[PDB]
């Protein structure tokens, strides 16, 4: 058993929506596709669920950021100002 | 001059100080904490994988005992039986019918997987965090230096000495017992080498993967082969390596708290965003500029014309330039309300140039420093609309 | 039958208890902690040594200036000097009197001794305690296995499984930061890796041997050669390497505290004889013998005859045996008062047979426990005159 690399997966690109501090997600993949995030403060309240029907999700996004992980696609990060005016 | 500097654990986001020496033109920092890469302290404390029952041969005495002995393999699980009538390829070849023994011997091995595809458990300590610092400095306008945390570390890579930390902020993500996986991290409470329950996770535990030696609770039984037929029942928990990949827990590159991400590699904890740092720095006065060539600028007036109430460098001000020579005059907010995209700005004599910057406060009443002439930019600001990409350059939330 | 106990940390001293089994005969033990090696946590954090002013041959232009560079070996102390007149071999070879130019070139390098003979420094902390315990268990006569002090590890080695501490007495001899010298071990707050003052220890401090980086505060001035010939001033301190050889400190290994000893070895701190140990064994039931088999012993007496108030198993007391059977039956004091060098005695039909033991109170009302038996050996003792030989046996005193 070698180390290599396979040719290998990847998961149909997320249809970012905007809210007040909040990431909006129609999500629509392939396969199963295991979803992760990080709230970034040292509360870091993460997310895993295993996605293969599609759903619209959310994230209550904070204000130093989060990030997000749409299956082995590279993981994303988010400024969540304010947007409350 | 040594510019000594509390800043905040951020990495992807410049921190453009301002070093004030008397005496001499002062001269902005750009100091960008490009990585926050840690390398705690650690120990390879056993490699975990599945196990491979790789059964050694048994022994058939056709008429008689066959007294099994406890070899020294790991988990050597070994037991006589009797009352077989092996079939093999002939019938049955024993000419017995009780006293036709089988003795079944199966020891545990690490997987050839075991080198590859494993698990890999640490008693983590606490290390020492790093950086690759890039410093666009002043006029020298580049150094991206490796460097240190502890507060005596110089790193005299370009011309500049940095001195780092000790940061304040000690939370290690990985927590002290830690199980490691190609790249996912986690920082599970690994039972220990040598104990691990079979079916749990380590059931097999190697020190590492040539150590011959290991632990083996896999609660391997053997059973009797049945109605007179060669083969071994072996009957073992399929691995607690097979489970941890596909009932395990999430990643600590998934959960862990204060902004970081992992590696397999030498087991940093990149970018972890929490804290500050105390940082000085001691410049070289040759990239000093004496303060008689540069431009006295006061009479001047600022004022901003669109401030955007945000993270983007939205806010921009006008500001009325009335110098006494022409030339460069590097600015900065000694204010941290305001966050400049300009370091330096170019003047004629007593124009007007516009820069760039982001604030929290609705009214921004930070001050402006332009090459030793304070001024207040007060003003008002506007929200934004449009809030979904990375993070931002302001940094600055406090009571507004 | 997992039989706790609480366990004085002391080394060179068997502790013979007692499994007290509901069902079966008692077994006794004999667990004589035969070390206590430490080993803790540390890090290699730099070697120093004397340094070496390995000088690189000076330069000599004849007539005109040769300006110096900062070449970045260690400590690379270079100066040039002017007005000489170099004799060599010839008299002066220079024709000019002034132009006659001298450039001195010094730095710092690890001695060849810095790779033997060198002192080293540690950041130490706690780790995991060890043991080389011997059991002469039961009828088992003999286990002797390295263990541990982590109050889940077994160790297998024998037929007896044991579990040993945590121990309570987390005195770590070592100190925070430690120098280590070839075998002699020193608490020493070393300054740091790169900071040493010159003269002070560390004055060279190389990460390790092979590392061609260090840090070299040695305050190597070069002076100018005098009256026109060929050498080299080099004005500096001997080394804190030297100092520390001479006007150093005194050895862990003699100053600690808590009864320790120690080697340039794994880094262990041996014998710590401090606190107790929570150990835990689990028997094989194997060696049990059921309760059937041993000889009831009730009806006996007990007397001391000649008891001695001492540590030496000086206190002896026969016994009125009065047994059922005839055979062995292992022994104890329950009470910690009566140390006994004997734990088995064999007994003929209902005989008498004398042990030897130790005692710490003038009146020793201490039960003993003839293999399910109790009596009390009550007495008096009397004190010895010869105390000058190595450690007690009795190592039980208390109010008295």
Redesign the interface.
């Known amino acids: ?3 290599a690399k396979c040719i290998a997966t990847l998961a149909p690109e997320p249809l ?3 809210k ?2 909040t ?1 909006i997600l129609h999500l629509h993949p392939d396969h199963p596709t295991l979803l ?3 709230s ?5 309240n ?1 997310t ?1 669920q295993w996605i293969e029907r599609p759903t619209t999700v959310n994230f209550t996004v904070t ?3 989060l ?1 997000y ?1 749409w299956g082995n696609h590279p ?11 | 001059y040594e510019h000594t500097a509390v800043m905040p654990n951020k990495v992807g986001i410049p921190y453009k100080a301002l070093v004030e020496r008397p005496g001499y033109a002062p001269v902005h920092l750009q100091i960008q904490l490009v990585n926050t890469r840690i390398i705690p302290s650690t120990n390879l404390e056993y490699i975990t994988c599945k196990y491979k029952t790789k059964v050694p041969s048994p022994v058939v005495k056709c008429c008689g005992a066959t007294q099994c002995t406890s070899k020294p393999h790991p988990d050597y699980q070994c037991q006589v039986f009797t009352g077989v009538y092996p079939f093999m390829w002939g019938g049955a070849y024993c000419f017995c019918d009780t006293e036709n023994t089988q003795m079944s011997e199966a020891y545990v091995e690490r997987s050839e997987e075991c080198s590859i595809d494993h698990a890999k458990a640490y008693k983590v300590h606490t290390g020492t965090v790093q950086a690759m610092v890039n410093i666009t400095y002043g006029s020298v306008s580049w150094r991206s230096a490796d460097v240190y945390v502890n507060g005596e570390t110089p790193a005299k890579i370009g011309d500049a000495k940095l001195i780092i930390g000790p940061l304040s902020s000690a939370w290690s993500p990985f927590d002290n017992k830690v199980v490691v996986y190609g790249h996912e991290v986690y920082n599970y409470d690994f039972p220990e080498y040598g104990t691990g329950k079979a079916g749990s996770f380590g059931d097999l535990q190697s020190r590492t993967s040539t150590s011959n030696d290991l632990y083996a609770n896999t609660n391997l039984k053997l059973q009797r082969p049945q109605a007179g037929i060669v083969h071994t029942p072996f009957t073992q928990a399929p691995s607690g390596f097979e489970r941890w990949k596909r009932d395990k827990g999430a990643p600590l590159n998934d959960v862990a708290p204060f902004g970081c991400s992992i590696a397999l590699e030498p087991l940093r904890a990149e970018n972890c965003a929490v804290g500050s740092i105390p940082i000085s720095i001691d410049i070289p006065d040759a990239a000093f500029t004496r303060i008689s060539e540069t431009p006295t600028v006061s009479d001047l007036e600022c004022k901003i014309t669109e401030c955007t109430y945000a993270s983007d460098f939205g806010g921009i001000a006008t500001v009325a330039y009335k110098s006494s020579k022409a030339g460069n005059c590097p600015i900065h907010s000694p204010s941290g309300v305001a966050v400049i995209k300009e370091n330096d700005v170019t003047l004629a004599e007593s124009g007007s140039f516009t820069f760039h910057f982001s604030t929290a406060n609705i009214h921004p009443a930070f001050k402006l420093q332009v090459c030793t002439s304070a001024v207040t930019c007060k003003g008002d600001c506007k929200p934004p609309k449009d809030h979904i990409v990375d993070y931002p350059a302001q940094h600055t939330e406090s009571f507004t």
């Open positions: 058993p070698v180390k970012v929506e905007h007040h501090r990431l992760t995030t990080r970034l403060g040292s509360d870091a993460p895993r204000g130093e950021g990030e992980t993981p994303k990060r988010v400024w969540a100002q304010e947007s409350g005016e």
